[PDB]
């Protein structure tokens, strides 16, 4: 099942305080007005793995903290590094130690740093940047039991964590005797409105719709009457022409280069190369060459 | 064979909008391109999308260029 | 403008980026100053 | 100098598994591509596996693919072979092979063999 | 690939120039053959590798040649203690395949 | 533990070590003369002492005579491109010193992996062996020119020549950003004085201003304020909150 | 403006004079060019 977020996914991008500043940044983000995947697991209706891709937006509705865990693993079998996040009764313990995990982990009702510590909505954005794993949290009381309210929530960065993994998949851990949302971050520009006190009250997307590109270019939420130039139209090239002439002759480079005799410097021989197909890949590949410094052309691209 | 190089079509992207308090509806103006390369209306200024052309005459409110003007009305 | 080649695409070709930034930067500063001259000319002639 | 110890001659019941050793003593170990070869009585020699000692990864010959698991224990400087689904005709002399796996130094295949099982 | 040798056995008296050639059904390379000499009831010993790059610790008297699909191993001066089994051995790629062997008898 | 370490990793698997929550004495590193090449790019060698750095990563591997100049931003080479690529905007110091005393005893331990990784993004490790992949249509053997083993190793002999003589090199990678500074230098600090024109350097921000109490309330995580012009206007006192 | 860091105080803290001069000359060229544009804007607008 699918539904739209309508507002959500705005987080504090940088490590600063800004007061009443409309500042536009480019970073991974959950697009406005986009499908967020909707699942159930109740009554046996188990939970599947998901494609992590570039980023994940996770939203949980839980009354008795049935959702208890998250994993971000490639093979999940002790071959490669795996992180465990579990939040049991009073302690939030974070172990990014290499662990052997059972294929279906459930609860009945090789290692760097280690961390220890519907009326409500908990929103989590898990993201890994520059070898650092950053967890975003926000708890918001809601009366709309059915679906996501059309309200703006800002997720603070809770802790920063040095994991460094090839994350490709995602799973949620559930108690066995809910609904969770999944969306994929993509690089987009947001224009963030900070208050006087710094709470992120509202934000506007930059590619969502023609009003939004105008809002981003004007760098204001309110846009007055008039014509505004925002971007440039451009037909993107589709095919590619690699038209070159066809010549049978090969390069006499190999014969010149491995020639038995070369002339002396006072009378250096000049050799004319013309009307032949020449491959410089062979020249790059050979490792006998002590010196390959090139000025006019970069050495990799000569061929 | 003698081939001409004509650079790919392009132009500025202008947004026609009434004030955000009034509405969120929007019309996009593609400059100097025929309405094939992209309520589609073609004028000498360029391809105009999202606007309903009318031959009724009114005073100019928002100028489109090439004699075309835009306004918010029933 | 004192670069290896005047054609920008030819600058993207004919050499890799890590060295190419200096040639591009010299092109950028030259062209941008050319705009500065042309635009300032436009404003003053427009004032006329 | 370099040698691989000969075993006591073996006869095996069909369906069992046989483990054959290969000792390396002397010289500069862990830089050689120790491998595994055999020759049946009255037939030419046939190759089974190849081991790059540093990453301890092996490949099995097509004809014997799916029946041989081969590992090399760097700590004891030994090379091990494991063969399953033994049959009556499989009783025979078993050899061991090696040689540096280094390119641009020529090489790739050399001798440095021992005596057998 | 099957490495077809020439011939199965050459019956040569001592001192003869013995060309124990070996021919490949498709091209392999000119630094892509190796020859091993197996002593009676033992394990073979390398003498020439990469078709012509003479292995260290071996006399010059043994000398391999050829390239492409046709390769040649030459033994220039047979002596009485040289009667033994010789194997060609493809060196390029694929599963290692060893020649059928040449037995030198009196 | 990382620089004067008993063991150094190979170019094949260069170790990356986290350094955090530690005051750093850069003086002993600079004054000590055992270091052969100490050329710096992002920071002055002499002034490597005063400044504060948020995060310092140390990279360890062992190189020949040519790589001391080969390992640099924008330089192209066999090991430089195929093995370990230095980012063109790298902010840091490359450090190298003699390795005859510890290594080159025959010491065959080191490995460098040539042709397999044609393109590698910066600061990336390739631990996959991948035996072939040189390029050609056939496969499953090496054959000739078709493919060859990338993982070649160094041979260090007690007879190694000066040109191929080995050297130990450690690259400390400084990532310059705005975040809580784990490492700083050995300078004690004065207390706080307010409402006075004072030259100030807080967590290594630096500048001149008048320190006053601010009624503005940070969110707990935030550390540095800023202006419309993106200049520092609010700071959180590090020692006391 | 094509320098290692946009903050001037940062340049003074991190890099010493021999390369610092090249860095600051980049800031002076960029910032000063921007100032020249700004003044020509102000001067023309003040004429208007
Ligand atoms: C915990 O760490 C150990 C190593 O400290 C990991 O196991 C090693 O895996 C390598 C293969 O790369 C073997 O060569 C070592 O012998 C192994 N050591 C041990 C002690 O098993 C191990 O996988 C890590 N994780 C767990 C769950 O133990
Ligand atoms: C540039 C050139 O032709 N180099 C050749 C090389 O290709 C060949 O393999 C070798 C063998 O003699 O001789 C040399
Ligand atoms: C969003 O979901 C609806 C129905 O679930 C689907 O028709 C639409 O194509 C989806 N949007 C995108 C961009 O795929
Ligand atoms: C919570 O979990 C941690 C580790 O996951 C465990 O050590 C602890 O005993 C658990 N219970 C409580 C009450 O902290
Ligand atoms: C911002 O938060 C502070 C916290 O005390 C509060 O007093 C203030 O009213 C808030 N501002 C707005 C605009 O809500
Ligand atoms: C713009 O919106 C405000 C409401 O926020 C309203 O009071 C005002 O009249 C609107 N402007 C016009 C021209 O209608
Ligand atoms: C519309 O496009 C056609 C070709 O697609 C072109 O011939 C014609 O001139 C265009 N219209 C105008 C007004 O240029
Ligand atoms: C307006 O367009 C309609 C439909 O094409 C046409 O019937 C009518 O004559 C036009 N009127 C004017 C004033 O141009
Ligand atoms: C490293 O260890 C040697 C031991 O001989 C010592 O002389 C040297 O001072 C040490 N270097 C550092 C930086 O501690």
Short mmCIF file of C-alpha atoms in Angstrom, two decimals, chain F residues 16-212:
data_model
loop_
_atom_site.label_atom_id
_atom_site.label_comp_id
_atom_site.label_asym_id
_atom_site.label_seq_id
_atom_site.Cartn_x
_atom_site.Cartn_y
_atom_site.Cartn_z
CA UNK F 16 42.15 3.36 9.02
CA UNK F 17 42.08 4.22 12.72
CA UNK F 18 39.64 6.39 14.66
CA UNK F 19 41.20 9.05 16.91
CA UNK F 20 38.95 10.87 19.38
CA UNK F 21 38.65 12.63 22.77
CA UNK F 22 42.40 13.21 23.17
CA UNK F 23 44.57 16.31 23.54
CA UNK F 24 47.30 16.11 20.89
CA UNK F 25 50.95 17.12 21.24
CA UNK F 26 52.02 18.08 17.70
CA UNK F 27 55.29 19.57 19.03
CA UNK F 28 56.95 16.16 19.59
CA UNK F 29 55.91 15.21 16.04
CA UNK F 30 57.38 18.37 14.55
CA UNK F 31 60.58 18.72 16.61
CA UNK F 32 61.49 15.02 16.25
CA UNK F 33 63.92 14.76 13.33
CA UNK F 34 63.46 11.07 12.47
CA UNK F 35 60.89 12.07 9.83
CA UNK F 36 62.29 12.27 6.29
CA UNK F 37 59.50 14.02 4.36
CA UNK F 38 57.01 16.21 6.19
CA UNK F 39 55.49 18.23 3.34
CA UNK F 40 52.07 19.65 4.28
CA UNK F 41 49.14 20.86 2.15
CA UNK F 42 46.16 21.86 4.30
CA UNK F 43 48.06 23.18 7.34
CA UNK F 44 51.41 24.82 7.99
CA UNK F 45 54.04 22.36 9.28
CA UNK F 46 55.26 24.89 11.86
CA UNK F 47 51.77 26.06 12.89
CA UNK F 48 50.36 22.50 13.12
CA UNK F 49 50.49 23.05 16.93
CA UNK F 50 48.13 25.90 17.90
CA UNK F 51 45.04 25.10 15.83
CA UNK F 52 42.20 22.72 16.75
CA UNK F 53 40.89 19.99 14.46
CA UNK F 54 37.55 18.24 14.85
CA UNK F 55 38.60 14.76 13.63
CA UNK F 56 42.01 13.26 12.79
CA UNK F 57 42.33 9.98 10.83
CA UNK F 58 45.70 8.23 10.50
CA UNK F 59 46.45 6.10 7.41
CA UNK F 60 49.26 3.53 7.52
CA UNK F 61 51.19 1.84 4.67
CA UNK F 62 54.76 1.35 3.39
CA UNK F 63 56.17 2.74 0.13
CA UNK F 64 59.24 2.63 -2.11
CA UNK F 65 61.49 5.53 -3.10
CA UNK F 66 59.32 6.82 -5.98
CA UNK F 67 56.03 6.96 -4.07
CA UNK F 68 57.25 9.66 -1.64
CA UNK F 69 56.66 12.16 -4.48
CA UNK F 70 53.98 9.98 -6.14
CA UNK F 71 51.57 10.15 -3.13
CA UNK F 72 50.25 13.72 -3.50
CA UNK F 73 47.00 15.35 -4.74
CA UNK F 74 46.63 15.58 -8.51
CA UNK F 75 49.64 13.36 -9.19
CA UNK F 76 49.02 10.27 -11.31
CA UNK F 77 50.71 6.90 -10.92
CA UNK F 78 50.36 3.14 -10.75
CA UNK F 79 49.90 2.90 -6.96
CA UNK F 80 48.60 6.49 -6.69
CA UNK F 81 45.61 5.85 -8.93
CA UNK F 82 45.10 2.08 -8.83
CA UNK F 83 45.60 1.62 -5.07
CA UNK F 84 45.11 4.69 -2.86
CA UNK F 85 43.92 8.03 -4.21
CA UNK F 86 44.53 11.23 -2.35
CA UNK F 87 41.63 13.72 -2.65
CA UNK F 88 42.60 16.84 -4.58
CA UNK F 89 41.37 19.08 -1.73
CA UNK F 90 43.04 16.98 0.99
CA UNK F 91 43.80 19.02 4.10
CA UNK F 92 46.72 17.48 5.95
CA UNK F 93 50.34 16.42 6.12
CA UNK F 94 52.04 13.46 4.46
CA UNK F 95 54.64 11.95 6.79
CA UNK F 96 57.32 9.45 5.80
CA UNK F 97 60.46 8.07 7.45
CA UNK F 98 63.13 5.37 7.14
CA UNK F 99 62.22 1.68 7.22
CA UNK F 100 65.57 -0.09 6.74
CA UNK F 101 65.99 -0.64 10.49
CA UNK F 102 62.67 -2.45 10.96
CA UNK F 103 61.91 -3.92 7.53
CA UNK F 104 64.00 -5.36 4.65
CA UNK F 105 65.56 -8.21 6.61
CA UNK F 106 64.02 -12.00 2.85
CA UNK F 107 61.09 -9.91 4.08
CA UNK F 108 58.34 -10.67 1.54
CA UNK F 109 55.42 -9.43 3.63
CA UNK F 110 54.17 -6.44 1.66
CA UNK F 111 51.60 -6.50 -1.19
CA UNK F 112 50.30 -3.71 -3.45
CA UNK F 113 47.61 -4.88 -6.01
CA UNK F 114 48.17 -3.13 -9.39
CA UNK F 115 45.82 -3.36 -12.48
CA UNK F 116 42.46 -4.56 -10.98
CA UNK F 117 41.05 -1.21 -9.63
CA UNK F 118 41.04 0.99 -12.78
CA UNK F 119 38.93 3.70 -11.03
CA UNK F 120 38.58 4.18 -7.23
CA UNK F 121 36.75 6.99 -5.45
CA UNK F 122 38.88 8.71 -2.76
CA UNK F 123 39.54 6.94 0.56
CA UNK F 124 38.17 3.60 -0.67
CA UNK F 125 39.49 0.13 0.15
CA UNK F 126 39.32 -2.82 -2.27
CA UNK F 127 39.58 -6.03 -0.23
CA UNK F 128 38.13 -8.20 -3.03
CA UNK F 129 40.83 -10.46 -4.46
CA UNK F 130 39.24 -10.66 -8.00
CA UNK F 131 41.99 -12.84 -9.61
CA UNK F 132 41.38 -11.84 -13.29
CA UNK F 133 39.55 -8.79 -14.85
CA UNK F 134 42.53 -7.39 -16.83
CA UNK F 135 40.29 -7.45 -19.97
CA UNK F 136 39.62 -9.69 -23.06
CA UNK F 137 36.66 -11.83 -24.07
CA UNK F 138 37.79 -15.31 -22.78
CA UNK F 139 38.15 -15.91 -19.06
CA UNK F 140 38.56 -18.49 -16.24
CA UNK F 141 42.31 -18.68 -16.97
CA UNK F 142 44.92 -15.93 -17.05
CA UNK F 143 46.13 -16.84 -20.62
CA UNK F 144 48.27 -14.28 -22.43
CA UNK F 145 47.66 -10.50 -22.34
CA UNK F 146 43.98 -11.49 -21.79
CA UNK F 147 44.27 -11.22 -17.96
CA UNK F 148 46.93 -11.29 -15.15
CA UNK F 149 46.96 -11.37 -11.30
CA UNK F 150 46.67 -7.80 -9.88
CA UNK F 151 47.88 -8.73 -6.35
CA UNK F 152 51.65 -8.53 -6.85
CA UNK F 153 53.83 -8.25 -3.76
CA UNK F 154 57.00 -6.41 -2.86
CA UNK F 155 60.17 -8.40 -2.45
CA UNK F 156 62.41 -6.83 0.18
CA UNK F 157 65.82 -8.49 0.44
CA UNK F 158 68.74 -7.67 2.85
CA UNK F 159 70.40 -6.63 -0.47
CA UNK F 160 67.72 -4.05 -1.49
CA UNK F 161 69.14 -1.06 -3.49
CA UNK F 162 68.61 2.63 -2.46
CA UNK F 163 66.30 3.26 -5.46
CA UNK F 164 63.94 0.41 -4.46
CA UNK F 165 64.80 0.95 -0.79
CA UNK F 166 61.60 0.83 1.31
CA UNK F 167 60.26 3.70 3.39
CA UNK F 168 57.52 3.88 6.02
CA UNK F 169 54.85 6.53 5.40
CA UNK F 170 51.96 7.60 7.61
CA UNK F 171 49.29 9.94 6.28
CA UNK F 172 47.20 11.76 8.88
CA UNK F 173 43.90 12.83 7.29
CA UNK F 174 42.43 15.96 8.86
CA UNK F 175 38.77 16.49 8.00
CA UNK F 176 38.12 20.22 8.51
CA UNK F 177 34.45 20.81 9.46
CA UNK F 178 32.32 22.43 12.15
CA UNK F 179 31.54 19.84 14.87
CA UNK F 180 32.76 19.02 18.45
CA UNK F 181 36.56 19.05 18.32
CA UNK F 182 38.01 15.80 19.64
CA UNK F 183 41.70 16.77 19.29
CA UNK F 184 43.40 20.02 20.30
CA UNK F 185 46.85 21.10 21.38
CA UNK F 186 48.51 21.40 24.81
CA UNK F 187 47.55 24.93 25.86
CA UNK F 188 45.85 25.70 29.14
CA UNK F 189 43.13 28.32 28.93
CA UNK F 190 42.11 31.43 30.85
CA UNK F 191 38.68 31.92 32.42
CA UNK F 192 35.89 34.01 30.89
CA UNK F 193 35.93 37.82 30.77
CA UNK F 194 32.87 39.65 29.46
CA UNK F 195 31.92 43.13 28.19
CA UNK F 196 35.48 43.89 27.09
CA UNK F 197 37.15 44.22 23.68
CA UNK F 198 39.09 40.95 23.75
CA UNK F 199 40.88 38.93 21.10
CA UNK F 200 39.20 35.54 21.34
CA UNK F 201 39.73 32.05 19.97
CA UNK F 202 36.99 29.63 21.06
CA UNK F 203 37.36 25.94 20.10
CA UNK F 204 39.73 27.37 17.46
CA UNK F 205 37.18 29.71 15.84
CA UNK F 206 39.45 32.83 16.28
CA UNK F 207 38.48 36.51 15.72
CA UNK F 208 37.94 39.71 17.69
CA UNK F 209 34.77 40.62 19.56
CA UNK F 210 32.93 41.58 22.73
CA UNK F 211 31.78 38.57 24.77
CA UNK F 212 28.30 39.02 26.24
#
